[PDB]
Structures are given as C-alpha cells and as structure tokens.
Design a protein around this motif. Structure first.
Motif, PDB file in Angstrom:
ATOM      1  N   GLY A 113       0.779  -1.221   0.000  1.00  0.00           N
ATOM      2  CA  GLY A 113       0.000   0.000   0.000  1.00  0.00           C
ATOM      3  C   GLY A 113       0.818   1.282   0.000  1.00  0.00           C
ATOM      4  N   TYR A 114       2.137   1.213   0.021  1.00  0.00           N
ATOM      5  CA  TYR A 114       2.950   2.415  -0.038  1.00  0.00           C
ATOM      6  C   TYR A 114       3.181   2.805  -1.484  1.00  0.00           C
ATOM      7  N   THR A 115       3.194   4.106  -1.718  1.00  0.00           N
ATOM      8  CA  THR A 115       3.509   4.678  -3.034  1.00  0.00           C
ATOM      9  C   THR A 115       4.594   5.728  -2.912  1.00  0.00           C
ATOM     10  N   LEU A 116       5.307   5.912  -4.021  1.00  0.00           N
ATOM     11  CA  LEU A 116       6.462   6.789  -4.039  1.00  0.00           C
ATOM     12  C   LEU A 116       5.999   8.156  -4.529  1.00  0.00           C
ATOM     13  N   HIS A 117       6.370   9.208  -3.787  1.00  0.00           N
ATOM     14  CA  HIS A 117       5.976  10.570  -4.097  1.00  0.00           C
ATOM     15  C   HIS A 117       7.200  11.469  -4.120  1.00  0.00           C
ATOM     16  N   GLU A 118       7.141  12.501  -4.956  1.00  0.00           N
ATOM     17  CA  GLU A 118       8.166  13.519  -4.965  1.00  0.00           C
ATOM     18  C   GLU A 118       7.537  14.813  -4.475  1.00  0.00           C
ATOM     19  N   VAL A 119       8.165  15.432  -3.480  1.00  0.00           N
ATOM     20  CA  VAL A 119       7.593  16.578  -2.801  1.00  0.00           C
ATOM     21  C   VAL A 119       8.691  17.561  -2.456  1.00  0.00           C
ATOM     22  N   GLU A 120       8.355  18.840  -2.484  1.00  0.00           N
ATOM     23  CA  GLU A 120       9.258  19.888  -2.011  1.00  0.00           C
ATOM     24  C   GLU A 120       8.969  20.123  -0.536  1.00  0.00           C
ATOM     25  N   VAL A 121       9.976  19.972   0.327  1.00  0.00           N
ATOM     26  CA  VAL A 121       9.744  20.020   1.762  1.00  0.00           C
ATOM     27  C   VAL A 121      10.636  21.034   2.467  1.00  0.00           C
ATOM     28  N   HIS A 122      10.048  21.738   3.429  1.00  0.00           N
ATOM     29  CA  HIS A 122      10.781  22.605   4.342  1.00  0.00           C
ATOM     30  C   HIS A 122      11.361  21.769   5.486  1.00  0.00           C
ATOM     31  N   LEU A 123      12.691  21.778   5.602  1.00  0.00           N
ATOM     32  CA  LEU A 123      13.432  21.000   6.583  1.00  0.00           C
ATOM     33  C   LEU A 123      14.223  21.926   7.491  1.00  0.00           C
ATOM     34  N   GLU A 124      14.396  21.512   8.738  1.00  0.00           N
ATOM     35  CA  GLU A 124      15.365  22.114   9.635  1.00  0.00           C
ATOM     36  C   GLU A 124      16.201  20.992  10.229  1.00  0.00           C
ATOM     37  N   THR A 125      17.375  21.356  10.735  1.00  0.00           N
ATOM     38  CA  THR A 125      18.270  20.386  11.339  1.00  0.00           C
ATOM     39  C   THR A 125      19.010  21.021  12.511  1.00  0.00           C
ATOM     40  N   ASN A 126      19.879  20.235  13.142  1.00  0.00           N
ATOM     41  CA  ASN A 126      20.615  20.722  14.298  1.00  0.00           C
ATOM     42  C   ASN A 126      21.817  21.555  13.864  1.00  0.00           C
TER      43      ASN A 126
END
Length: 223
Positions: A113-126
């Motif tokens: 049931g999983y599908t592969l998607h391409e998305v633009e994402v806002h990320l933060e890190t340490n």
C-alpha cells in the motif's frame, strides 16, 4: 542529479544502500501516524500490525477527525499552516549512480500500500548539520509560497486511499494492536521501540507527543 529521500520510519535506522549524506531533519508539512497496517512484516494477513505513514497537511485539514487528532498532539494546536506540522526524521542523499534503486527500497521492508511521491519540503536540522543542509538547499534553489527554502525529496507514503490505511485510529485502538501483533520481522512492539530508539539517538528538544503517548499506552497493555 541524485535524489534526496526522506526517512520517517524504518529507513531511519535501517538506511538505504549507498547514501552519501544522512541529515537529521525536522520535516514540516506532515504528521506521522501508525495508521498503515502491516501483513508481511509486523503482523499477518489475518492479524495485521501497525506501521508508520505520513499524512500531509492538505489531507489533515480536509477531515475533522484527522485535524482533531493532529491538534491533540501538536505543540502548535490549533494548527494553521503546513509549517505547524512537524515530523522528526532524516533525509538521505543517494548519488546519481544509485538513484534508480530508490524505486526498490521497500522490497526489504514494509511495502503493501505504499507509493512513491516527490515533494518539495521545508526541513530544519541541528547545529551540527546546518551547513550541510544549507549546501543541499543551494543545489536546486527552491522556495515555498512563504519564501522559505525547500528541498525536492522522494518519500514513500501510505496515502489515505491505499488498501492498508487504517486511520484515523485513537492511540488506545492502535496500541491494542501493536501490543499483540508480530510477523516475520518480529513483534510490532519492536518496530515501535526501534523508531523511538532512533529518534532518541538524534536530538534536534523537539519530541513527538503522539509517539510518546502511543508507546506509553502499548506499555500499559503489555504490563
């Protein structure tokens, strides 16, 4: 050139092959819930388990039950925008020589049931990885509607329409399943415990209140 792949479940602690960066990430715009059933790994066809999926903001706001559940565990309740949603995970970089393997990463893990998607994402890190994340953002310079830098990423999601989606479910309902289920990969409890371990190895302190309540409730059922 290569691809950035988000990990929010088993890819955190069982990484893909050949990555050349692994950046701990606050992923904005999605909530992570154990609303995907597992029938080949952490449960069986007749007695499925529960594994992680991500639900995007645009799906959350369209169902009252999803929105109330997200607000129940969010420090930004009532959420007003995708940036209010936070999932703690990682992002991997896969070089061009290996990018085509991304389409096969689920062959060794939860997959139905999983599908592969391409998305633009806002990320933060340490602080330890800020410079590395900044370089990643500067390769394909992209910004969202609010002017924030975003990363083009691939992610595997059990969407709301997929056959294995079981949400919305309360923590009590999900915990009752997790506490009893197991499949060929081991117990459903071990899957939850490994995710909690992996997040604790990755301090960014941002915590996942849903996962904390889920584990506390599973422990009550197991006690």
């Amino acid at each position: 050139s290569g691809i950035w792949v988000l990990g929010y479940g088993s890819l955190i602690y069982k990484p893909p092959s050949h990555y050349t960066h692994r950046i701990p990430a606050i992923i904005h715009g999605f909530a992570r819930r154990f609303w995907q059933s597992s029938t080949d790994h952490r449960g069986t066809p007749a007695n499925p388990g529960r594994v992680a999926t991500l639900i995007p903001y645009e799906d959350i706001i369209r169902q009252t039950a999803f929105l109330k559940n997200v607000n129940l565990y969010s420090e930004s309740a009532p959420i007003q925008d995708p940036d209010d949603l936070v999932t703690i995970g990682v992002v991997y970089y896969i070089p061009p020589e290996h990018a085509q393997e991304v389409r096969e990463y689920l062959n060794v893990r939860e997959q139905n049931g999983y599908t592969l998607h391409e998305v633009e994402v806002h990320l933060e890190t340490n602080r330890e990885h800020e410079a590395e994340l900044g370089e990643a953002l500067e390769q394909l310079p992209r910004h969202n509607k609010s002017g924030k830098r975003v990363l083009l990423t691939s992610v595997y999601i059990g969407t709301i329409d997929n056959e294995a989606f079981v949400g919305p479910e309360t923590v009590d309902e999900t915990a009752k399943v997790i506490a009893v289920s197991h499949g060929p990969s081991g117990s459903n409890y071990e899957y939850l415990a490994k995710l909690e371990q992996a997040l604790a190895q990755m301090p960014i302190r941002i915590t996942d209140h849903y996962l904390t309540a889920l584990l506390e409730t599973v422990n009550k059922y197991r006690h």
